Write a protein that binds this ligand. Structure first.
Ligand SMILES: [Zn+2]
Ligand SMILES: [Zn+2]
Ligand SMILES: [Zn+2]
Length: 178
């Protein structure tokens, strides 16, 4: 197994996947690495299994159909994995914890949102459809773009949104388009 966390790329107290060489901090993995379970298989491995059990699940889908899906166990897992892919980028640090807004010439968003809040919401089964999770994720970046206006820091929101959107299209097998 790897000697660094797959998510944050640091060493420490690491839990190793039994079916692949990846390793994780307890609260870096999503869901948090389970207490017992021998063997244990990481989220990467669990997602690969879904694909292998239903190869047709990789055929293209429309975003509007994906969003309306209920959060059954496979969709819960896919949203957890998508959230984890965002944490995998170091620039997610800017979006992880609760933000505050005091900048001359700007007013904070009406509905603040942050990655750890989405993480708690998934853990607490607060989303009934994929649409609820995707709307909160996109709101993070939209709030950032609106608040930072012409400051070059706006670009951090564009960058992390692009990581979210590419992974969304991959994980939910969105139909490729020009
Ligand atoms: Zn970690
Ligand atoms: Zn694994
Ligand atoms: Zn099948």
């Amino acid at each position: 197994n790897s000697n660094i966390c797959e998510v944050c790329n640091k060493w420490g107290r690491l839990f190793c996947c039994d079916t692949c060489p990846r390793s994780f901090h307890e609260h870096c993995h999503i869901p948090s690495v389970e207490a017992n379970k021998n063997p244990w298989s990481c989220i990467f491995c669990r997602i690969k299994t879904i694909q292998e059990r239903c190869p047709e699940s990789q055929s293209g889908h429309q975003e509007s159909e994906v969003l309306m899906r209920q959060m059954l166990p496979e969709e819960q897992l896919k949203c957890e994995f998508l959230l984890l892919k965002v944490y995998c980028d170091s620039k997610s640090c800017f979006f992880a914890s609760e933000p505050y807004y005091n900048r001359e010439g700007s007013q904070g968003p009406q509905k603040p949102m942050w990655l750890n809040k989405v993480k708690t919401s998934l853990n607490e089964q607060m989303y009934t459809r994929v649409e609820g999770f995707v709307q909160d994720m996109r709101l993070i970046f939209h709030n950032h773009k609106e608040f930072y206006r012409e400051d070059k820091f706006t670009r951090l929101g564009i960058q992390v949104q692009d990581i979210f959107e590419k992974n969304f299209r991959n994980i939910f097998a969105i139909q490729e388009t020009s």
